[PDB]
Design a protein around this ligand. Structure first.
Ligand code: O3A
Ligand code: ZN
Length: 139
């Protein structure tokens, strides 16, 4: 689990979004595994505006942050799940690292802020849904 809180927005994995998320839906992309919901409290997270390919992500299944190199956001084939067990996920970044289902929502961050959230795992690769293109999150 985990979310990004920036201004009056909550960013979550679309597959973990709650009733309240969908009740206050701002934007969702099933191809990206992202949902943004509206919040009453003003969030204080900073979204990275950059093309960093290095950062640190939180891995709940190890209670540890890992520094990683990650690929630029791309259209990536993803398998096995129950929300979508096989399809192309867009705006996805991979790194070599540990991820399990429950690690989804872990934040990946660089010096410039939040890069994205853990979205996919399997074969020792961790997929992060990029948020850096969502310039609207900051206004
Ligand atoms: C196992 N796996 C793949 O098969 C991808 C890797 C690049 N193209 C196919 C995958 C997908 C998403 C996240 C982590 C791993
Ligand atoms: Zn950066």
């Amino acid at each position: 689990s985990g979310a990004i809180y920036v201004g009056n927005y909550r960013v979550v994995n679309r597959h973990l979004a709650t009733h309240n998320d969908w009740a206050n839906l701002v934007w969702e992309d099933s191809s990206r595994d992202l949902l943004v919901s509206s919040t009453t409290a003003q969030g204080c997270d900073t979204i990275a505006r950059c093309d960093c390919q290095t950062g640190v992500y939180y891995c709940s299944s190890r209670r540890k942050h890992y520094p990683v190199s990650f690929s630029k956001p791309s259209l990536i084939f993803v398998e096995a799940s129950e929300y979508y067990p096989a399809r192309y996920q867009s705006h996805l970044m991979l790194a070599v690292g540990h991820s399990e289902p429950g690690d989804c929502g872990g934040i990946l961050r660089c010096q410039h802020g939040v890069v994205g959230i853990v979205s996919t795992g399997g074969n020792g690769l961790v997929g992060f849904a990029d948020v850096r293109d969502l310039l609207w999150l900051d206004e």
